[PDB]
Structures are given as C-alpha cells and as structure tokens.
Paper text:
The engagement of NKR-P1 on the NK cell with LLT1 on the target cell inhibits NK cell cytotoxicity and IFNγ production and contributes to NK self-tolerance in a similar way to the orthologous rodent NKR-P1B–Clr-b receptor–ligand pair. In this study, we present several structures of LLT1 under various conditions: monomeric (LLT1_mono), dimeric deglycosylated after the first N-acetyl­glucosamine unit (LLT1_D1 and LLT1_D2) and dimeric (packed into hexamers) with homogeneous GlcNAc2Man5 glycosylation (LLT1_glyco).
The monomeric form keeps the same fold with the exception of the position of an outer part of the long loop region. The crystal packing of LLT1_mono was investigated to confirm that the form of the protein in this structure is really monomeric and that no possible partner participating in oligomer formation can be found among the symmetry-related copies. The classical dimerization interface is left open to the solvent, without any crystal contacts. The monomeric form of LLT1 was crystallized at pH 3.5 and the changed protonation state at low pH corresponds with the changed preferred intermolecular contacts and the formation of oligomers. As an example, residue His190, localized near the C-terminus in the dimerization interface, is charged at low pH and destabilizes this part of the interface. In LLT1_mono His190 is very likely to be protonated as it forms a hydrogen bond to the N-terminal Gln72 O of the same chain.
Residue numbers in the entry: 72 to 146, 161 to 193
C-alpha cells in the first residue's frame, strides 16, 4: 500500500502532477527534475488513458521527444497530450505539463 503527495494524483503505483501554468518542454522537464521526477513517462496504455481522462481541456507536455530523422524516445519535436491522444510540437512552445514518479510506499 502506497500514497502520493497531496498535490499529486495516484494511478497504479505512480503519481502524477498536472501543472497550473505553462512552460516550454525543457523548462517543464527542469521543473519535474526538482521533484526527483520526470515529464510523464507513460508505461502502459491504461496509464495513457488515465492521463487523457484526467487532464482537462489544455494541452500537456509528456516526457516523449524526437531528434530529427530519429524515433520518438521516452526520457526537434516534443510530444504533448491533446484530448484524443498524443501530438507533436516544437519544444519551445508553452504548454501545461504532467510529471510522473513512483508512488510513496508506506511500509508495514
Ligand atoms: C524555455 O524557456 C526558458 C524560460 O523559462 C528558457 O530559459 C529556455 O532557454 C527556453 N528553451 C527554449 C526556448 O527552447
């Protein structure tokens, strides 16, 4: 059994932080790096669906990016979630973001 910090939201073993403000992709990653977290690393389809359902009507950066000629990689272009799925934009644009981290295990 497990918990998330109070401003974060839990979904199966992970915690996610949905931002108030907008940043570019690198400055969102810097922000998440502070929480010893990362721009959201979506490990499963169920997790993607969760973020799509929870996120609200704004675009949100996730931790997926691409150097030109090269494939998309999880932590050029950067990916965000819109209402239907993922899309790309230049990394200098300003969007809300999602951080992810493993949840806090509460030992017994
Ligand atoms: C993102 O914006 C920040 C301002 O917080 C700036 O320091 C950084 O260089 C920017 N990165 C870009 C424009 O790619």
């Amino acid at each position: 059994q497990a918990a998330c910090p109070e401003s974060w939201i839990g979904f199966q073993r992970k915690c996610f932080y949905f931002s108030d403000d907008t940043k570019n992709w690198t400055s969102s990653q810097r922000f998440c790096d502070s929480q010893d977290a990362d721009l959201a690393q979506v490990e499963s389809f169920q997790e993607l669906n969760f973020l799509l359902r929870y996120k609200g009507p704004s675009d949100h950066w996730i931790g997926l990016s691409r150097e030109q000629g090269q494939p998309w990689k999880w932590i050029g272009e950067c990916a965000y979630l819109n209402d239907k799925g993922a899309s790309s934009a230049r990394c200098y644009t300003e969007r809300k973001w999602i951080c992810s981290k493993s949840d806090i295990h509460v030992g017994t």
